[PDB]
Amino acid sequence: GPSVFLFPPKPKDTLMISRTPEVTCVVVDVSHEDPEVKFNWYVDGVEVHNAKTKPREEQYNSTYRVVSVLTVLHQDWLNGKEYKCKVSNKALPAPIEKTISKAKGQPREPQVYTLPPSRDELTKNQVSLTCLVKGFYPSDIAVEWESNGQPENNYKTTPPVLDSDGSFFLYSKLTVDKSRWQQGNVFSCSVMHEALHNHATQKSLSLS
């Protein structure tokens, strides 16, 4: 028995005109007893034909994996068009279909509050910079830390949590040496989201 998993593009990919957002249809456990598969693709039902079926990853525990990949228009995903993936096989007397779309609902723009380190943390050598990103919908989003135009590396980001009103929040924690913070370096939480003007915003953080 074989299985399908339909996969949404990256946030950053659909929000940046430079990039190529992609729907990743995934079939796992295609045995050697019937290794040939097929893919049909649909956009509001309309059959499309710009779909690269990239072969054919092998696997450790004696399984396989055949993945199709459809490129998509940024404003066709953002408008919310449903992307259907008709999979076909001889090991399946009926086609398995799997459909996805962007989270329906009114897009709510993020509020972004950066947060200084705790007085209690200045004891240590490194120090935490906190980024509150709250009130957004859908949950698709991108955060990055930077300083003086370059990225920061030691940052980590929580997944987005369903908040009480029905929007989302998440936090980001950039870790930097107490020395860079006290020296007066300025840092930025950078947020990419669909309901932001120009799909992005940036908040500053600096010990004045």
Ligand X SMILES: *[C@@H]1O[C@H](CO[C@@H]2O[C@@H](C)[C@@H](O)[C@@H](O)[C@@H]2O)[C@@H](O[C@@H]2O[C@H](CO)[C@@H](O[C@@H]3O[C@H](CO[C@H]4O[C@H](CO)[C@@H](O)[C@H](O)[C@@H]4O[C@@H]4O[C@H](CO)[C@@H](O)[C@H](O)[C@H]4NC(C)=O)[C@@H](O)[C@H](O[C@H]4O[C@H](CO)[C@@H](O)[C@H](O)[C@@H]4O[C@@H]4O[C@H](CO)[C@@H](O)[C@H](O)[C@H]4NC(C)=O)[C@@H]3O)[C@H](O)[C@H]2NC(C)=O)[C@H](O)[C@H]1NC(C)=O
Q: Which residues bind ligand X (CB under 6 A)?
A: 3, 5, 7, 24, 26, 28-29, 59-61, 63, 65
Which of ligand X, a second copy, none does residue 40 bind (CB under 5 to 8 Å by kind)?
A: none
Query: What is the C-alpha R_g of the chain?
Result: 22
Token couple for 140: 């698709």
CB 145: neighbour CB atoms within 10 A?
A: 24
Near a second copy by CB under 8 A, which window of 3-11, 81-89, 98-106, 152-160? Answer: 152-160
Per-residue binder mask for a second copy (CB under 8 A), 170-199, x = binder = xx-x-x------------------------
Residue span binding a second copy (CB under 8 A) among the ranges 1-9, 32-40, 58-66, 163-171:
163-171
Nearer to ligand X, 4 or 115 (CB): 4
Asked if residue 172 lies in contact with residue 128, where contact means CB atoms within 8 angstroms, the answer is no
| Nearer to ligand X among residue 32 and residue 49 (C-beta) | 32
With CA atoms as reference, report the closest residue to 11 among 184, 180, 193, 158.
Answer: 193
Q: Which 105-144 positions form the footprint of a second copy (CB under 8 A)?
A: 111, 113-118, 120-121, 128, 130, 132, 134
202 binds a second copy (CB under 8 A): no
Torsion, Cα 193 197 198 199, to 10 degrees, reads: 0
Beta-sheet pairing, 186-192 with 111-115:
unpaired
E strands present in 19-94: 22-28, 37-43, 46-48, 51-54, 65-71, 83-89
* CA gap 144, 192 in Å, rounded: 9
By beta-carbon proximity to ligand X, the closer residue of 26 and 78 is: 26
Q: Give the binding-site size for a second copy (rule: CB under 8 A).
A: 27
CA 53, 56, 59 angle in degrees (round to 5)? 145
Query: Of 73, 91, 103, 162, which one interacts with a second copy (CB under 8 A)?
Result: 162
Give the nearer residue to ligand X in terms of CB position, either 29 or 44.
Answer: 29
Spatial separation of the C-alpha atoms in residues 131 and 109, rounded to whole Å: 15
Strand partners, 25: 6, 68
Q: Which stretch binds a second copy (CB under 8 A): 62-70, 100-108, 158-166, 176-184?
A: 158-166
Residues making contact with a second copy (CB under 8 A):
111, 113-118, 120-121, 128, 130, 132, 134, 154, 156-159, 161-164, 169-171, 173, 175
